[PDB]
């Protein structure tokens, strides 16, 4: 099984990339369930730029063909306690995302699940032994509410609802 992303317009197969990282936002407020929720970043290109793990691919919430960590998944932030500061997530092993060309780009469900687990594990190092939950974007302008990227002189918009819907103890 794979995770498919509704894209618009339809990205050509040669626009398939390797996810080398992503950027998140920790949800504010409090919960009596001892859980920490993370969503796609509600920040700007500024948040993305300060991550400094991108290559030559202009993308929003997922880093395409960027820098990979040499040991383990590394997470960074200007301030872990400030929920207005995004969290930069650099992967150790890239995950293939293949575009069929008919409007969908598919990602391996197993590899992405394992990836989220490595992210959640590292997140537990910073926020303690709590339940890590990934939820879809809180919203925003088309470029940022979707996983958007440039390829071959064209800008595509891919919904990432199915990428961020997991719970990890």
């Amino acid at each position: 099984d794979t995770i498919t992303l509704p894209c618009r317009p339809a990205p050509p197969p040669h626009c398939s990339s390797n996810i080398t990282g992503l950027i998140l936002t920790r949800q504010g407020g409090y919960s009596n369930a001892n859980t920490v929720i993370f969503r796609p970043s509600g920040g700007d290109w500024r948040d993305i730029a300060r991550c400094q793990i991108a290559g030559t691919v202009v993308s929003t919430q997922l880093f395409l063909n960027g820098s990979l960590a040499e040991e383990e998944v590394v997470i960074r932030s200007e301030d872990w306690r400030d929920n207005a500061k995004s969290i930069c997530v650099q992967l150790a092993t890239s995950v293939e995302i293949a575009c069929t060309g008919a409007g969908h780009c598919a990602i391996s469900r197993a590899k992405w699940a394992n990836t989220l687990k490595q992210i959640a594990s590292k997140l537990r190092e910073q926020y303690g032994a709590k339940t890590i939950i990934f939820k879809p974007s809180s919203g925003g302008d088309p470029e940022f509410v979707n996983h958007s990227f440039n390829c071959g002189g064209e800008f595509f918009y891919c919904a990432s609802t199915q990428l961020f819907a997991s719970t990890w103890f």
Partner: antibody
Amino acid sequence: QVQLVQSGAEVKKPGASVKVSCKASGYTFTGYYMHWVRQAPGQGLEWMGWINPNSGGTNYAQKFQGRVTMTRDTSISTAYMELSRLRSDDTAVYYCARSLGRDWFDPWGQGTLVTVSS
Amino acid sequence: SALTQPASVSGSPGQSITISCTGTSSDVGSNLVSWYQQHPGKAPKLMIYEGSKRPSGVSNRFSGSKSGNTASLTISGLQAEDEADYYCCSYAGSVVFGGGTKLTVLG
């Protein structure tokens, strides 16, 4: 001078929705996050969420996740706050505040009174 | 998180008064809270930010300090216009305001 001006007081029925606007002046609207804080009559201040004026991105408190929607109109430098499925305990004065950092809210709007009653 | 403030406090003109704000979470020494002044029927206003820093236009009478798990707002030259509600605010994790301390100036 830096100034935030909010819309007028409103009376509402439970189950309905309300949309408050916050007009910014004296500074570049996109330069700062906009936060929303409400205050029940005779009670304290309660944080609701912030919005990124450049990306439209938001982050609501889990207490209001699914009931609040925060938007903006950069053309008229206005931030909007909409709360749906209102209840009696949503009766409060709603403030908008310029982030200016972490918890360094300045300045605040004059506030908008939303009375929810059957 | 949760911040605890005294419900009210009293002071006579000219004297100094201190309002305390104690956190029940994991308390780090590493400039925690801000302070807000709110007159009745008015919006809150920033008096002290990042523990002790004071923004432009705010009188020197308002000073900020901290000891252990308790942050404190101290007003030196107490005047009648100081009569308002004072809230402490922390951003750690998620923005949380204190219960508020209703200061009364006994004139």
